[PDB]
Design a protein around this nucleic acid. Structure first.
Lengths: 122, 53, 60, 86, 177, 138, 113
RNA sequence: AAUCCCCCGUGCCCAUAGCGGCGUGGAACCACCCGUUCCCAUUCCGAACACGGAAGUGAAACGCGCCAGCGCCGAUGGUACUGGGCGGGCGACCGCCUGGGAGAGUAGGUCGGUGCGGGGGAU
RNA sequence: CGCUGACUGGGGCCUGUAGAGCACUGAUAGGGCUAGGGGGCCCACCAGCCUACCAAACCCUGUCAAACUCCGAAGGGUCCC
RNA sequence: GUCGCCUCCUAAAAGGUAACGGAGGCGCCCAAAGGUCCCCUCAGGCGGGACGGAAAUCCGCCGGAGAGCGCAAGGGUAGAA
């Protein structure tokens, strides 16, 4: 069946987030799927005690879109190594990750018979 | 009622005249001179309804 | 029609409420006396519960 | 002119919950099952409960009333054979 | 060895010289028989640690004996036992003991000792195929060492109805190490 | 069986203060032990102690194991006098349910530890039962 | 959770919403490939294959019309039985333009809703 | 059109249907699929919701089967507790007589069982 | 008013102490696996190393609960016959 | 000391009972926790990457809901409040 396991995209994010207005507007222009999420906590490791603020930025981008980005954005990054994490997936840079997509990935999405994703398929 | 100048203040609301009023408890807390809603005075039925008093 | 013939013993003096009724029920006036009935789980029951109450005899 | 501490001592007051009409009696358009007032009655008997099965009340009229979760709101109708043609 | 009974009489039975004890077997049971005197002797040997059987009407001379029971009561004198045989080649549920010797390591030199939350070994070798007395003791003992499942060391019949790393038997300070 | 006000309002959630369980040494067969028959909110302290003195007289190999442990407690004089009695705690233990598996003198041939425990019973309080286990004591 | 509280997506209970009363569970089961609805009415009721994409083949008019008819007819088939006013059954998804379609059916179908 | 095999909508029994390990199905079915002007639509993209349509595929969700490892179910004989009756001990309590008799604990049992309708599949 | 009443036989439907039980919770002991603090060693920004003292949490051997209970009777209730 | 009222336990299992018996809350509030119509799937743990080395923010798996609900408890209960 070698026509299975053999890959076919699957998500792939790329974001950022600072204890804050607009900076994500530089985010909008580079793509088109704005991320609006609220980080938090309550300490002074940066002055981020505020436990309920809007600073988390995350511009989701799988398939289609991500393609234009994987593309016009894959040249300025210089590495290709280690940064290779188990769960077929990896994260480099000012904040970006992308996940593998072996054939036994999805199922892990079902509300039912949620096969805890076997470790021989992924 | 127990008149307590504590964000606890009782008020009503006319019926554009529909004539009289109808019961209501309140709290400056927010929106001060704010208070509107419809009902129906002995006057036909319905009618805008400010609450201020 | 198993006809039952019981007698009176150990005065229910001060003994359980109901228990007594089962007394006046089955039909129990004066002491150490003898009465008879049909098996009838009903009547039966009562009496039995009354158990120690006195003595049952299968007669007719 | 106040009150003290370190005397926990704090009796509690009264309630009055029940199953009134229990299961399978002369049904009367009135307080069905009770253990949560403001209740929102239902249709006939109830069988849904943090237990499993269900309960019939061979008694049928307008409706009864719930208790908020406990028992198990009615809906599984059950007028009772005593609801046919006179 | 012998033991009889099986009607329907536990109280008196459960009394005197005869203690209850069901005739348990895969598929069928039969009123409790036995006796409060046999249990003794035999049991005394090593209930579910070896195995035999008794001749009641020559009926079915088979093994398996006890897979449950209890001297329960306070007094500490059993009453109401369970009995199940096995004329099959499936014998699993096999719990037979395992003994050391005294190999000198932490003891006869370090005084130290060792707990053996194990002792027994419910496994399942070659059905109707087990050495009533199996011994295994690679030795070792003292300091903060410990041995359990995992390592072990199983001979022939490759079962292990059990798991790895778990209550084997270590060496602790009978005083201090 | 009067017991306490709750496991976290009156007095519930402690260590009870004592001297842990195990002592002596292993032993696969030899069943050497002790249990009782008496009912009594086993006198903590008295307890803790006792058992201990047990080790005090032996030392090493003989399952100085012991399956007890209090965990609730009484109360009395504190405040006015005798009437409306609030409560001042003190002395937890555990019900020795009319006999049962006490502590174990468990080991091959080491009666030098049986006598011990023995010394252990002597002590204690509620009489005690001197005994053996599956097999006896070797 | 209870079977219907660990999976996800459905709303069946938003079906039981109409269950209470109003008339037949004019329930409309969809599966793109086509649309299929029954008529679960109270009392261990049942149904009467009122309208299906296959019943009368699956045509070649896609969504639009399909419904437009499947419904109507459906509605036709039933009001022959002896129904009248039947309650709608969004079976699933939001009264999508399909849905809405079929819907029409009923309505136009003269089976009030 | 008033019989079985199959798939599809789907209901009751609130795990003897769940977990997961391997597998099988696409003529038919169903989904995934192919695209996105207009219906509607994502706080971000027509991923999900969504309109139109072949090729491609059974990978995936999914349906039937096999597997007891995790679970779930669970007897008989059995011991506690006890309604009722009466005795021992100053004692905390012990016992007897008569009907009730669980959980856990080994056997073993389970990989659903069963409604109605729709598509076919069996002149 | 007149067989409706205490009581018994039958039939449903309920409560869920005693007991028991550990997956909810809070104890708590013997221990294994482990990282938090150690602790001794390259002198120790080393964040590399071994291991006998304290631990958190998961795993085995165990155990207490009136304001715990996946479990569950004695019995009492209530409508009908 | 304390008297009202809300919950637990006590009540022995229908309901309900003292104790100056146990412990803990209330004399608020929310104009939007209001009414419906439309959508959502928790805590947490694990694995991978910005500012981040407790403790986020996103991405991919596991989940009788153990999170969730202005306030004390207790019932509830995501299908969901």
């Amino acid at each position: 069946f070698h026509e299975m396991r053999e890959p076919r995209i699957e998500k792939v994010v790329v974001h950022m987030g600072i204890g804050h207005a607009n900076a994500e507007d530089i985010l909008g222009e580079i793509t088109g799927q704005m991320p609006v999420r609220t980080k938090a906590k309550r300490t002074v490791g940066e002055f981020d005690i505020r436990e309920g603020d809007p600073i988390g930025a995350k511009v989701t981008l799988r398939d289609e879109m991500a393609e234009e980005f994987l593309q016009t954005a894959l040249p300025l990054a210089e590495l290709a190594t280690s940064q290779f994490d188990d769960t077929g997936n990896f994260s480099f840079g000012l904040d970006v990750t992308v996940n593998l997509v072996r054939p036994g990935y999805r199922v892990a999405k079902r509300d039912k018979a949620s096969r805890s994703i076997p470790t021989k398929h992924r | 009622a127990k008149d307590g100048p504590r964000i606890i203040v009782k008020m009503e609301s006319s019926a554009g005249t529909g004539f009289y009023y109808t019961t209501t408890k309140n709290r400056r807390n927010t929106q001060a001179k704010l208070e509107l809603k419809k009902y129906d005075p002995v006057a036909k039925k319905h009618v805008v309804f400010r609450e201020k008093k | 029609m198993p006809r039952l013939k019981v007698k009176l013993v150990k005065s229910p003096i001060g003994y359980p409420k109901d228990q007594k009724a089962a007394l006046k029920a089955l039909g129990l006036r004066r002491l150490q006396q003898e009465r008879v009935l049909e098996d009838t789980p009903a009547i039966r029951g009562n009496v039995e519960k009354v158990a120690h109450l006195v003595r049952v005899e299968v007669v007719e | 002119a106040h009150k003290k501490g370190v005397g926990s001592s704090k009796n509690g007051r009264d309630s009055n919950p029940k199953y009134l009409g229990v299961k399978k009696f002369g049904g009367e358009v009135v307080k069905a099952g009770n253990i949560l007032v403001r209740q929102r009655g239902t249709k006939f008997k109830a069988g849904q409960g943090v237990g499993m099965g269900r309960d019939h009340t061979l008694f049928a009229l307008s409706d009864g009333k719930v208790v908020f979760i406990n028992k198990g709101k009615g809906a599984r109708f059950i007028s009772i054979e005593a609801a046919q043609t006179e | 060895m012998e033991l009889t009974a099986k009607p329907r009489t536990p109280k008196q039975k459960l009394d005197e010289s005869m203690i209850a004890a069901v005739a348990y077997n895969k598929e069928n049971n039969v009123s409790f028989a036995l006796d409060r005197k046999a249990f003794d002797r035999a049991f005394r040997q090593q209930s579910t640690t070896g195995l035999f059987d008794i001749t009641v009407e020559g009926g079915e001379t088979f093994p398996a004996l006890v897979k449950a029971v209890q001297m329960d009561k306070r007094k500490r004198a059993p009453i109401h036992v369970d009995f199940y045989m096995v004329t099959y080649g499936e014998p699993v549920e096999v719990s037979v003991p395992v003994h050391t010797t005294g190999r000198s390591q932490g003891e006869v030199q370090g005084g130290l000792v060792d707990i053996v939350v194990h002792n027994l070994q419910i496994v399942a070798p070659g059905p109707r195929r087990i050495p009533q007395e199996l011994v295994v003791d690679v030795t070792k003992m003292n300091i903060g060492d410990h041995i359990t499942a995992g390592d072990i060391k199983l001979p022939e019949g490759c079962t292990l109805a059990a798991d790895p790393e778990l209550t084997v038997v270590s060496v602790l300070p009978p005083r201090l190490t | 069986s009067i017991k306490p006000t709750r496991r976290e309002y009156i007095s519930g959630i402690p260590g009870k203060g004592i001297a842990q369980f195990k002592m002596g040494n292993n032993t696969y067969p030899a069943q050497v032990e002790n249990v009782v028959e008496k009912p009594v909110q086993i006198r903590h302290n008295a307890l803790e102690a006792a058992r201990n003195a047990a080790n005090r007289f032996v030392q090493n190999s003989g399952k100085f194991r012991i399956r007890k442990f209090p965990f609730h407690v009484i109360r009395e004089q504190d405040g006015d006098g005798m009437r409306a009695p609030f409560g001042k705690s003190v002395g937890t233990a555990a019900r020795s349910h009319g006999a049962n598996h006490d502590f174990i003198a468990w080991v091959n041939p080491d009666p030098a530890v049986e006598f011990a425990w023995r010394r252990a019973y002597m002590k204690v309080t509620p009489t005690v039962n001197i005994d053996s286990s599956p097999a006896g004591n070797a | 959770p209870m079977r219907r509280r660990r999976e996800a997506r459905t709303d069946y209970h938003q079906r039981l919403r109409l269950l209470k009363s109003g008339k037949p569970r004019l329930v409309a089961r969809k599966s793109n490939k086509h649309v299929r609805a029954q008529l679960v009415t109270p009392n261990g009721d049942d149904t009467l294959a009122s309208a299906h994409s296959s019943d009368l083949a699956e045509y070649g008019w896609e969504p639009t019309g399909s419904a437009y008819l499947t419904g109507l007819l459906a509605g036709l088939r039933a009001q022959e039985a002896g129904v009248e006013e039947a309650v709608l059954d969004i079976g699933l998804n939001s009264p999508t333009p399909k849905v809405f379609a079929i819907q029409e059916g009923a309505i136009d179908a003269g089976l009030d809703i």
